[PDB]
Amino acid sequence: SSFKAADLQLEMTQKPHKKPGPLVFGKTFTDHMLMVEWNDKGWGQPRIQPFQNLTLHPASSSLHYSLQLFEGMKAFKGKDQQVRLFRPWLNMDRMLRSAMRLCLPSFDKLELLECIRRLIEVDKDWVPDAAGTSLYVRPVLIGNEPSLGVSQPTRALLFVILCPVGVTPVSLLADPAFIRAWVGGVGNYKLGGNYGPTVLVQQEALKRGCEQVLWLYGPDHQLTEVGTMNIFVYWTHEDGVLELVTPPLNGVILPGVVRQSLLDMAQTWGEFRVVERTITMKQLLRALEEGRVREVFGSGTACQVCPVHRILYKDRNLHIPTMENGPELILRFQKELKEIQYGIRAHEWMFPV
Amino acid sequence: SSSFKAADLQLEMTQKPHKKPGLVFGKTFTDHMLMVEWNDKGWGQPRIQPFQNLTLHPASSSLHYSLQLFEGMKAFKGKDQQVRLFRPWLNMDRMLRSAMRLCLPSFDKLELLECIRRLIEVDKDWVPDAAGTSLYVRPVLIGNEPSLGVSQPTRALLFVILCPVGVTPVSLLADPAFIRAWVGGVGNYKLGGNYGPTVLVQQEALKRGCEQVLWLYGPDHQLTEVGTMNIFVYWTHEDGVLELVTPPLNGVILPGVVRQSLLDMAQTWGEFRVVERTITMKQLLRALEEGRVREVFGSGTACQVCPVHRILYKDRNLHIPTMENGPELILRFQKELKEIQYGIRAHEWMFPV
Ligand SMILES: CCCc1cc(=O)n2nc(CC(=O)N3CCCC3)c(C#N)c2[nH]1
Ligand SMILES: CCCc1cc(=O)n2nc(CC(=O)N3CCCC3)c(C#N)c2[nH]1
Ligand SMILES: *Cc1c(COP(=O)(O)O)cnc(C)c1O
Ligand SMILES: *Cc1c(COP(=O)(O)O)cnc(C)c1O
Ligand SMILES: [Cl-]
Ligand SMILES: [Cl-]
């Protein structure tokens, strides 16, 4: 059925690495990792063990047929020195959905969260407490069948590694030639296979003077995501109503935890209309011409909320007036999230470690 | 950047040769493997070494962001005990295109072929010679950056493993809800990410009483591929002309080596029209009602040519009269391929080891 946190085997490191004294995202790892193997017998006992290489059979289905998925969440240390995870239950939910989509074994969501709690507790001294710092948690589940048949694996590995990590607007390339995901595809799951093919496109954005990719979809050039983040637009819509809009969860949008949190927050304030609806380049162009756009930004765990100041759409260089509008909404979201995350105000959304 | 060279080959023979079999596809492996490492210093020296595990950093981009691609080709041992590869240059061409698509390092196609030649030569005794047997050759290129940033890797591994391997018609489920690939995507490259998402779809086909998936595309329900195989239809077309048709390479089709060979053979014969044209379910239904369909089949390395006798579409079973028609074209294809592959007829398609 599932591994249990009660059965956790703890193996402390004998070679602790020197902590940092900048923090480049996703390149510095803590002393320990979580590791749980699965096979015909079911799940093994979970272990917190020293950070170490994986040993994999050359035919492992994780490396041939991309039987792999991952999560990303953050732990924050408040002034009171208490470390708390941001809405981890949602990541656990999402990870399990990913596993079912790739025919990888299910596990108990609260059991994995506790194992992750235990892991972070072990490496708690790696959690930085400087302003705007955090610990990035990366769970991974891979198939590990030593067979070249494309099939449901009979073996799997679940592991978790940790990274300590340390508002500048960005430019985006919007070219309809590039496609991240399609309806009937798997772009709405956090699977490794969705990321590899984007590397070349990101290089092309850099080649054309932009920092990231604005992923367009469909004949009407829907704005779906920005880089690895969900996209939000704050504008006065064609009906004259002030609203926050983000694309709906219709197959091509990854259901971000930050995304859902911004919707929940804005919805709760009740000061302007908050909707999930498709957004087209055509609508954006008109809105920019009519001075109705206030702010455009991306949302996601690693970078949180990221303002957009420019979109290159074919040869048209479009100025996005996010920064000339405060950015009032971005700043308000960042302020409220910081209060919740760093335990300034106690909250339902934080899970203490 | 410059390639590894077959001249620089380091050989390390095994100490404990494993027992040969007296075979389920892709489960049994040979004694050696090829391994080449790439980094900021370029390609290292290729080496044939004993079959062994891969040791990878747990942040390896091969496991998080699917920086992985593979190839598949067969070696055949004729009665003269001579071993030959089938059109290996085409696999090398396709591997380099896949590599470029994932921003993985370029290499010299002739140099890699020579390394694989040397590898099979070292393991020549694993190549079985019984009727309908072959050695499956699985090259793989993976990213190996120990970083959670989605980026072009600065490290990579190319390895090759070998497997000895050993007309029954199949039924297909044709459900448009499942989409294998999209125009503008990566369905036309042999990347791991294209295969994982199909596992569940195949389970659903089995649940609905079908053996494999017929992958449909577009609002007009184009037949693109069958399972992991290209699709062919032999019929009298709407203009009353007998033809063999397969979908064109428009982006959603993997350019199969077997596919191209069947086109080449049928063109060489000059007995009927050979065309690359899209094929819709609407055309198939009409042709089936008018009795114009002779044979429907898949092509691919592992299974060669596979007849189809039934398709489940919109909850109704369509009988496909392939076996009723001989299947003459399928049998002729299989015989000519066999004669070429096992050396009965000399042919420039075969590459001696
Ligand atoms: C996939 C989850 C981890 C992760 C990897 C990675 O490379 N990035 N890169 C970004 C930045 C991004 O997508 N941007 C910056 C400006 C707008 C788009 C993020 C995030 N967040 C991220 N996450
Ligand atoms: C990915 C290349 C290796 C490979 C793996 C695998 O699982 N299969 N399965 C098939 C059979 C298939 O796709 N069928 C059988 C009936 C019609 C479709 C093949 C092949 N060829 C293959 N290859
Ligand atoms: C991870 C991710 C997001 C944002 O997800 P969060 O759960 O908010 O971090 C958005 N789009 C893509 C493609 C992603 O991989
Ligand atoms: C491997 C493959 C084929 C067939 O390719 P061959 O080179 O003929 O073996 C067809 N379709 C898909 C999706 C494949 O992966
Ligand atoms: Cl929550
Ligand atoms: Cl050839």
XYZ file of C-alpha atoms and ligand atoms in Angstrom, chain A residues 65 150, chain B residues 70-74 86 90-91 94 136 138 180 187-191 194-195 198 215 224-231 252-261 299-304, ligand 4:
62
model
C 11.032 6.340 -21.719
C 7.439 0.480 -23.133
C 17.488 6.825 -27.720
C 17.773 4.772 -30.891
C 16.901 1.247 -31.877
C 18.322 -0.960 -34.607
C 18.941 -4.604 -35.302
C 20.311 -2.900 -41.066
C 19.726 6.282 -40.821
C 19.594 5.677 -37.066
C 18.099 10.452 -36.543
C 18.741 -5.293 -30.639
C 20.088 0.535 -27.999
C 0.679 11.278 -28.991
C 6.767 13.586 -31.874
C 9.101 13.303 -34.880
C 12.184 12.784 -32.653
C 13.047 9.608 -30.703
C 12.977 11.272 -27.234
C 7.247 10.776 -26.044
C 6.915 7.276 -24.555
C 1.584 6.351 -23.665
C -3.045 7.313 -32.536
C -0.771 8.742 -37.550
C 0.821 5.736 -35.873
C 0.006 2.362 -34.311
C 1.539 1.741 -30.896
C 5.226 2.477 -31.442
C 4.992 1.710 -35.191
C 4.350 3.704 -38.376
C 1.086 2.946 -40.179
C 3.642 14.226 -35.809
C 5.208 11.183 -37.523
C 8.385 9.427 -36.372
C 10.454 8.808 -39.567
C 10.853 5.071 -39.166
C 13.741 3.234 -40.832
C 11.446 0.301 -41.591
C 8.822 2.779 -42.933
C 11.316 4.304 -45.395
C 12.492 0.849 -46.465
C 6.118 -0.982 -39.360
C 8.945 -0.773 -36.807
C 12.256 -2.322 -35.743
C 11.178 -4.536 -32.818
C 8.185 -6.151 -34.556
C 9.003 -5.510 -38.246
C 10.856 3.707 -33.103
C 9.557 4.219 -33.613
C 8.941 3.939 -34.955
C 9.584 3.027 -35.990
O 10.926 3.334 -36.209
P 11.947 2.294 -36.899
O 13.110 3.238 -37.060
O 11.199 1.811 -38.139
O 12.261 1.164 -35.954
C 7.702 4.518 -35.262
N 7.033 5.301 -34.390
C 7.486 5.610 -33.143
C 6.697 6.509 -32.228
C 8.789 5.079 -32.694
O 9.303 5.341 -31.473
